PDB file of C-alpha atoms in Angstrom:
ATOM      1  CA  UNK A   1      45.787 128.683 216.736  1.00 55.08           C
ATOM      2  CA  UNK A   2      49.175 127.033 217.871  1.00 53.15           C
ATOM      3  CA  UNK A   3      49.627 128.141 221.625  1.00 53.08           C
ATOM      4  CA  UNK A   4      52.497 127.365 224.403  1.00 55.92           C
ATOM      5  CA  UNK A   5      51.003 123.967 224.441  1.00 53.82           C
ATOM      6  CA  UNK A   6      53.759 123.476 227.309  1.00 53.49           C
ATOM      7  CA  UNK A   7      54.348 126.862 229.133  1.00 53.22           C
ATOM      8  CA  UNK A   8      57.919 125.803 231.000  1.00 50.66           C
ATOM      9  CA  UNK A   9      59.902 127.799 229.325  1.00 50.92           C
ATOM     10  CA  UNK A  10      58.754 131.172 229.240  1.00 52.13           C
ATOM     11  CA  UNK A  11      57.708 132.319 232.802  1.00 54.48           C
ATOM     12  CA  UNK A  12      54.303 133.470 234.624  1.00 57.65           C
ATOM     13  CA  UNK A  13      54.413 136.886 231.854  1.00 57.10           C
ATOM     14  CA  UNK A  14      54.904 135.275 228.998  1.00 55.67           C
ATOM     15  CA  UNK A  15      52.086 132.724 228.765  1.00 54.27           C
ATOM     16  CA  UNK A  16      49.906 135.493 229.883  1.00 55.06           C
ATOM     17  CA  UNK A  17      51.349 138.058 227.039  1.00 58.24           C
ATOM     18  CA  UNK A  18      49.261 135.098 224.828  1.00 54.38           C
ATOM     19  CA  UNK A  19      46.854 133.984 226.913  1.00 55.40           C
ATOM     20  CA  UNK A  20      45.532 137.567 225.456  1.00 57.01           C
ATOM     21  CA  UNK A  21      45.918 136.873 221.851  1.00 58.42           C
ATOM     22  CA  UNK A  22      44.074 133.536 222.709  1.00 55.47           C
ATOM     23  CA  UNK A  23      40.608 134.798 224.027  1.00 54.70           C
ATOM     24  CA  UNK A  24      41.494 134.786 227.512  1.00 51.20           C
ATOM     25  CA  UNK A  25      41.353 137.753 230.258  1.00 46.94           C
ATOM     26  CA  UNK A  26      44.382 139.249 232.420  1.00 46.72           C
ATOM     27  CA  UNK A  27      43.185 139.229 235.891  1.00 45.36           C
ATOM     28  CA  UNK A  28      46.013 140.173 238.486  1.00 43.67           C
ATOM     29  CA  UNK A  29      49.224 141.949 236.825  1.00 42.77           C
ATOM     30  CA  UNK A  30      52.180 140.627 238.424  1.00 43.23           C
ATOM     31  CA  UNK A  31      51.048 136.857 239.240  1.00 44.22           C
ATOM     32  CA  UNK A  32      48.442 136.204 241.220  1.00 43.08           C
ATOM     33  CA  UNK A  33      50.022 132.454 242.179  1.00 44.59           C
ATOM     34  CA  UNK A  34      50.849 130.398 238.882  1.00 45.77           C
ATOM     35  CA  UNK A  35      47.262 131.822 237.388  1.00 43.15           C
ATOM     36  CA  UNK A  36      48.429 132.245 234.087  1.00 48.80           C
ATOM     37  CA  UNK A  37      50.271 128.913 234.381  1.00 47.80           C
ATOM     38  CA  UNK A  38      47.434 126.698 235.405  1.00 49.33           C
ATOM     39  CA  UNK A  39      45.087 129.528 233.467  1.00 48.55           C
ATOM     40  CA  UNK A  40      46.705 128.180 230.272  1.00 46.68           C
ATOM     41  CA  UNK A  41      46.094 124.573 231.024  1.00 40.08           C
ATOM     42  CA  UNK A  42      42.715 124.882 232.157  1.00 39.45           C
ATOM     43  CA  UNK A  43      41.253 127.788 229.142  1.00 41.22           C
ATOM     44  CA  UNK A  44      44.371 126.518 226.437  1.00 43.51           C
ATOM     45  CA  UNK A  45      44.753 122.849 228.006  1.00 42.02           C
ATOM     46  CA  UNK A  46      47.989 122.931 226.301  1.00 44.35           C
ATOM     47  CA  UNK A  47      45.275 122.547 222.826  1.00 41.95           C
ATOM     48  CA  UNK A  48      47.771 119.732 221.388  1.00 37.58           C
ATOM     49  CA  UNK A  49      50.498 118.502 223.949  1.00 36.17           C
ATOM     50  CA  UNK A  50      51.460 115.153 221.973  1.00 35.35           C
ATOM     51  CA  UNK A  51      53.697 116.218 218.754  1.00 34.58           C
ATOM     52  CA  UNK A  52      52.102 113.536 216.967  1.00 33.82           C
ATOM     53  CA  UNK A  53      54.545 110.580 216.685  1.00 32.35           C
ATOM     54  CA  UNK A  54      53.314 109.871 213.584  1.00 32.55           C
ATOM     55  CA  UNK A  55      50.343 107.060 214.132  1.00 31.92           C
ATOM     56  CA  UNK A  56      46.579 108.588 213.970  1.00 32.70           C
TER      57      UNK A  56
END
């Protein structure tokens, strides 16, 4: 389950459009205060932030 591993691109709506998709509730609706931002990190973690240079 490939997810925004790095969320700086899309915005506070986007990463929460997923979040969804990725088992993970919609509190506020606007944006509470970078919730879905730091909500992704902290639920998501960014799952795989290094692309894997190549080197197990």
């Amino acid at each position: 389950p490939e997810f925004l591993e790095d969320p700086s691109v899309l915005t506070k709506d986007k990463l929460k459009s997923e979040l969804v998709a990725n088992n993970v509730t919609l509190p506020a609706g606007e944006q509470r205060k970078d919730v879905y931002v730091q909500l992704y990190l902290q639920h998501l973690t960014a799952r795989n932030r290094p692309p894997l240079p190549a080197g197990t």
